[PDB]
Design a protein around this ligand. Structure first.
Ligand SMILES: Nc1nc2c(c(=O)[nH]1)N[C@H]1C(S)=C(S)[C@@H](COP(=O)(O)OP(=O)(O)OC[C@H]3O[C@@H](n4cnc5c(=O)[nH]c(N)nc54)[C@H](O)[C@@H]3O)O[C@H]1N2
Ligand code: SF4
Ligand code: SF4
Ligand code: SF4
Ligand code: SF4
Ligand code: SF4
Ligand code: SF4
Ligand code: SF4
Ligand code: SF4
Ligand code: SF4
Ligand code: SF4
Lengths: 79, 386, 131, 296, 148
């Protein structure tokens, strides 16, 4: 239930934070999908986090490790 | 107001130090963030409900800086030290004044875990497998380091107890340096050359501490002067191998893989963990990355002409090595891929009503969850399975 | 000093051209040297200061910065565009692909000199610089 | 992109133009748009002009306010003294009716009325606010780390004091400006009596230069003892004092510090990659070259 | 296995990685990225190299010698390599070559690193020769990073 922050100023729209998030990958890549909500979607060229109320993230670091030009900061402390 | 109950929480390097000042008495709950594994056996056990669990996967992978695996509300903590006794991999310590001091054990008010480690030194053979497989840096092979990777601990030939005899023909020692221009045992000394005799004359000195049955120098002798022999006296066992007991986590990897069955480890927890592979969303090897006992694996994809219509699993576990910690469950971002349930903790020390409560807390089944409540954002909440 | 050099891409550069080849965004994105920190110290180049990149087939005054994409000691880099092609040598080796990456160049710290805009560069190379 | 009228008083445009240039560039890089104010003048400088006549102080500050009122925009400032004049006259004339009346019948001779419809902000206040560009956005925009530099902050007096008249919180040991310097990557250091006046306020800079310089020298001694490599500031008065006054201290006394004095907007430009020539660091009395060697 | 030889998808083709090469979870690659080995070769430490798992920081212009080293390794007597080739060290060469040999289905992408340096087309054709040689024991497919 952590909080992710995306630096819009250096986001290129690469979409490798959307493809690599394992909560996004739940809908289409799971047998009998449990939850179909998504943290990121690239609207107007930058990654927007729809997870406003910080309910779905799991601090996995797959998205921080994925962005090619580090731009996603993961906060492990309560918002 | 009043100031002197000074509550502080400082991140001194890699140790998160949580403190309570007084004039002369302090209280230091120190968490070593390099050893924490993200299990919650410190949050389930906290009598005072202060320890919460944070971004386990990110912290255990190094992608998080402003947090540890666990957050302790040092205003609520009571410095009992139950967390320090009940943490399987000792990554939490209590220091009262300046020394690691556990009053509850000093008064025998709490049982401790019976990891029960031991290495029968009359059976271990100084092998290197147990140090190699042990996931946690906790097996110590006290063994002089022979020619492998270093200068000889004693010598290649003294790693075994052998019996060798070397003899020469002073009648045929031309005193060329070949005998010791090869072995490090043969040292030929040419005593100074004087026209008195007008000849070369010295001595060939052979030391046991460097020989072998190599016998190369027999025929490296231009004149046939040399002889040798060999055999072992029983057993060698140079050094000792034993287990650090405050670091071992009952994985059974070294016991399962020891060549001579000389290691006696018993798992602290008992139960069962199941993986519903069909619910893993693929590229999320967080569970693999955070498992302390490396029980989890990504099942290797088969080659072609061998798949046989069965495609592959996405994740699985080795129940032989799983220690029922819970880091996998705390880290998985999935919904219910993992099912964890512990049935019996193994202890020494008698019992307590508090310990029965803690057993009841540790033994409730749990599984992952997506979309937990926002009011507790910044921590983890699992699913209670009926 | 010989300081081998390459000319490559960047997202800010692509973004800039699609804003427009005559835009302040394009100017800012392309007028850039991305060299090594060790080379900058050894040459004597203050970070974020104009510098004279002069190869055998031209010359250009370009801002000198340090790039995240770590160039090893002895490499330069201009984001491709007007400024880089002011200095790219035209040798093709009978293939039609000019030496767009890997031509020697000398670098001279020359602050207090302005940068030339894209229009000024091209229209003055041709002889059309009305403004 | 939030839009503000950019007041731009006397010292930044006419002595330290790099400050205003970096202000516009860095504010545009973060989500802020700084629009020129049409025919703005000296905010009647609160010391040297308020000491003479409070009524003409009110009238001139109100004229500056009604320019941006006609523009229908919120003022943005980069000077603590200009903040005092503009913001405080705005606040006083939003609540005091007889003073509104007096200023309005003075301004009616130039076809111009004050109604009190806009708000006044300091640029650092905007950089700190979370609705507008926040500390995290500043960290995002920073592209040159400026690491390994000890930097001493001078808050000034007219931004934060009196706390019964402002809304910035504690005046005894604020840390907000230290967070903006920490965002840039430079480590802000703490020195003795960090909240002391620089000595240039109230017209003392002009009336008694030796007195003002002694007040400044107390600060410079503390800052050198701490070990600063530059002094950030949010006021062109204080920058002028700390910059000229180092030279006047070197000549009137025998004290040498050679500590560069930079506006926070100039440091923000340096962090975001602007060139020293584009910041006009050659227009300062005290050479910035050692600091540039350290941070570049 | 995925090789980006002389290319920089992060800045040239931004959604190449998230659409075609690395991160998508395919049919036979259901595990996604975590079973893909990504090797990036170029003198810079580009953003593609940040995302990658290996990196062969090669001297600019020596890719022909690098390819020849790889192909001698593949043809089998790779012991005749010098101590280092093109700035790359022989053990790392052997590491990447072993990964390439064991690849179930590989793919090589190339760009300006090969088409704009010394030996414009000979770099590309030694790359294609390497691919044709690898298809002896594995399946490998060169592919050009076309721009517009
Ligand atoms: N934003 C943006 N995107 C673009 C373009 C653009 O202009 N702007 N251009 C488009 C078009 S026209 C092109 S053709 C494509 C091509 O773009 P790419 O083919 O992907 O090549 P580059 O982006 O130029 O980066 C090439 C990489 O090869 C490295 N390199 C340089 N010399 C050598 C060498 O000698 N050996 C090796 N191994 N590597 C070397 C370079 O450092 C660089 O990392 O991009 C397209 N995408
Ligand atoms: S940390 Fe994991 S779950 Fe959270 S947004 Fe990133 S990839 Fe998704
Ligand atoms: S991976 Fe990074 S650059 Fe790409 S869209 Fe996500 S945040 Fe932006
Ligand atoms: S290892 Fe587990 S029980 Fe021990 S401190 Fe870390 S999270 Fe708590
Ligand atoms: S010392 Fe006791 S109260 Fe404090 S965190 Fe540990 S278990 Fe909880
Ligand atoms: S694995 Fe067994 S035999 Fe080998 S060193 Fe360890 S204890 Fe001894
Ligand atoms: S090599 Fe043979 S002949 Fe020479 S000194 Fe030794 S034993 Fe004697
Ligand atoms: S038998 Fe071998 S090891 Fe022994 S002295 Fe001769 S050469 Fe040396
Ligand atoms: S018993 Fe298991 S966990 Fe403990 S040291 Fe041996 S291998 Fe490691
Ligand atoms: S497999 Fe066992 S040891 Fe590994 S994380 Fe899961 S419960 Fe813990
Ligand atoms: S079990 Fe959890 S950590 Fe492992 S692949 Fe599935 S979602 Fe990812």
């Amino acid at each position: 239930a952590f909080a992710v922050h995306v630096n819009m100023e250096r986001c290129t729209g690469c979409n490798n934070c959307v493809v690599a998030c394992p909560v996004n990958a739940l809908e289409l890549n799971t047998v009998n999908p449990s939850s179909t909500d998504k943290i990121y979607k690239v609207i107007n060229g930058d990654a927007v986090i729809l997870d406003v109320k910080h309910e779905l993230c799991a601090g996995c670091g797959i998205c921080v490790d994925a962005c090619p030009y580090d731009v996603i900061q993961l906060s492990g402390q309560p918002p | 107001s009043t100031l002197f109950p000074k509550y502080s929480k400082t991140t001194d390097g890699s140790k998160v130090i949580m403190e309570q000042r007084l004039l002369q008495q302090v209280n230091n709950l120190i968490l070593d963030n390099d050893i924490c594994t993200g299990c919650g056996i410190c949050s389930e056990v906290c009598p005072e409900e202060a320890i919460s669990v944070g971004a386990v996967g990110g912290v255990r992978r190094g992608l998080v800086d402003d947090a540890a695996s666990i957050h302790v509300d040092e205003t609520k903590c009571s410095y009992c030290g139950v967390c320090v006794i009940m943490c399987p991999f000792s990554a939490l310590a209590l220091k009262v004044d300046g020394e690691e001091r556990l009053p509850i054990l000093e008064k025998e008010g709490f049982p401790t875990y019976d990891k029960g480690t031991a290495i029968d030194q009359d059976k271990c053979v100084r092998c290197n497998i147990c140090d190699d497989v042990c996931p946690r840096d906790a097996i110590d092979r006290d063994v002089p380091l022979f020619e492998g990777e270093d200068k000889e601990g004693l010598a290649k030939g003294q790693a075994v107890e052998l019996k060798i005899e070397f003899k020469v023909d002073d009648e045929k020692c031309t005193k060329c340096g070949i005998c010791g221009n090869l072995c490090e045992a043969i040292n030929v000394l040419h005593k100074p050359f004087s026209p008195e005799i007008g000849k070369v004359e010295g001595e060939v000195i052979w030391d046991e501490a460097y020989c072998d049955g190599c016998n190369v120098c027999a025929e490296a002798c231009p004149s046939e002067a040399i002889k040798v022999t060999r055999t072992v006296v029983g057993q060698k066992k140079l050094g000792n191998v034993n287990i650090i007991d405050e670091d071992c986590c009952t994985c059974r990897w070294c016991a399962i893989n020891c060549p001579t069955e000389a290691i006696t480890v018993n798992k602290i927890f008992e139960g069962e963990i199941t993986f519903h592979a069909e619910k893993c969303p693929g590229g999320c090897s967080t569970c693999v990355d955070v498992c302390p006992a490396n029980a989890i694996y990504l099942p290797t994809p088969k080659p072609a002409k061998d798949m046989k219509g069965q495609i592959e699993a996405k994740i699985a576990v080795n129940k032989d090595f799983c220690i029922l910690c819970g880091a996998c469950v705390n880290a998985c971002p999935g919904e219910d891929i993992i099912y964890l349930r512990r049935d019996s903790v193994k202890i020494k020390g008698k019992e307590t009503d508090l310990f029965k409560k803690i057993k009841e807390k540790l033994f409730t089944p749990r599984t992952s969850k997506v979309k937990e409540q926002p009011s507790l954002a910044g921590s983890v909440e699992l699913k209670a399975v009926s | 000093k010989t300081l081998n050099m390459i000319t490559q891409r960047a997202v800010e550069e692509g973004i800039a051209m699609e804003i427009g080849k005559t835009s302040r965004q394009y100017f800012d994105a392309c007028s850039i040297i991305e060299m090594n920190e060790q080379d900058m110290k050894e040459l004597g180049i203050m970070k974020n200061t104009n510098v004279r990149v002069k190869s055998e087939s031209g010359e250009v005054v370009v801002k000198a910065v340090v790039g995240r994409q770590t160039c090893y000691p002895g490499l330069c880099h201009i984001r491709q565009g007007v400024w880089a092609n002011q200095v790219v040598p035209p040798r093709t080796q009978s293939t039609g692909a000019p030496q767009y990456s890997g031509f020697p160049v000398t670098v001279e710290p020359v602050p207090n000199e302005r940068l030339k805009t894209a229009l000024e560069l091209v229209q003055g190379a041709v002889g059309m610089w009305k403004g | 992109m939030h839009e503000y009228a950019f007041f731009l008083g006397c010292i930044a445009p006419n002595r330290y133009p790099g400050c205003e240039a970096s202000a516009i560039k860095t504010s545009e890089k973060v989500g802020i748009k700084l629009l020129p104010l049409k025919g703005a003048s000296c905010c009647p400088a609160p010391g040297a002009f308020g000491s003479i006549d409070l009524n003409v102080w009110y009238a001139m500050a109100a004229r500056n306010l009604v320019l941006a009122e006609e523009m229908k925009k919120d003022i943005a400032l980069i000077c603590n003294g200009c903040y005092k004049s503009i913001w405080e006259v705005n606040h006083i004339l939003k609540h005091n009716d007889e003073l509104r009346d007096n200023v309005n019948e003075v301004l009616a001779e130039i076809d111009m009325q004050f109604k009190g419809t806009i708000d006044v902000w300091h640029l650092a206040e905007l950089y700190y606010d979370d609705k507008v560009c926040g500390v995290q956005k500043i960290k995002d925009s920073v592209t040159t780390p400026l690491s390994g530099a000890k930097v001493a902050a001078h808050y000034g007096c007219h931004l934060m004091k009196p706390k019964k008249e402002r809304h910035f919180g504690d005046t005894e040991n604020p840390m907000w400006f230290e967070e903006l310097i920490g965002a840039l990557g430079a480590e802000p250091i703490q020195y003795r009596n960090k909240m002391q006046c620089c000595g240039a306020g109230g017209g003392v800079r002009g009336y008694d230069i030796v007195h003002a310089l002694d007040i400044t020298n107390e600060k410079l001694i503390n800052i050198q003892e701490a070990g600063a490599d530059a002094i950030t500031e949010l006021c062109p008065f204080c920058q002028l004092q700390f910059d000229r006054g180092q030279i006047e201290i070197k000549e009137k006394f025998g004290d040498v510090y050679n500590i560069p004095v930079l506006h926070y907007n100039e440091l923000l430009g340096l962090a975001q990659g602007m060139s020293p020539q584009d910041l006009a660091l050659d227009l300062h009395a005290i050479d910035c070259t050692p600091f540039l060697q350290k941070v570049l | 296995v995925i090789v980006y030889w002389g290319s920089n998808p992060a800045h040239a083709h931004p959604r190449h990685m998230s659409r075609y090469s690395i991160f998508p979870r395919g049919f036979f690659t259901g595990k996604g990225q975590k079973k893909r080995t990504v090797i990036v070769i170029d003198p810079r430490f580009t953003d593609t190299a940040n995302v990658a798992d290996y990196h062969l920081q090669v001297k600019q212009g020596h890719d022909y010698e690098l390819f020849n080293a790889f192909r001698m390794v593949i043809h089998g007597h790779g012991k005749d390599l010098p101590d280092e080739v093109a700035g790359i060290k022989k053990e790392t060469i052997l590491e990447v070559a072993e990964i390439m040999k064991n690849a179930r289905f590989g793919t090589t992408f190339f760009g300006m690193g090969l088409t704009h340096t010394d030996g414009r087309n000979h770099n590309i054709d030694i790359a294609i020769s390497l691919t044709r040689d690898l298809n002896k024991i594995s399946k490998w497919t060169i592919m050009a990073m076309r721009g517009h």
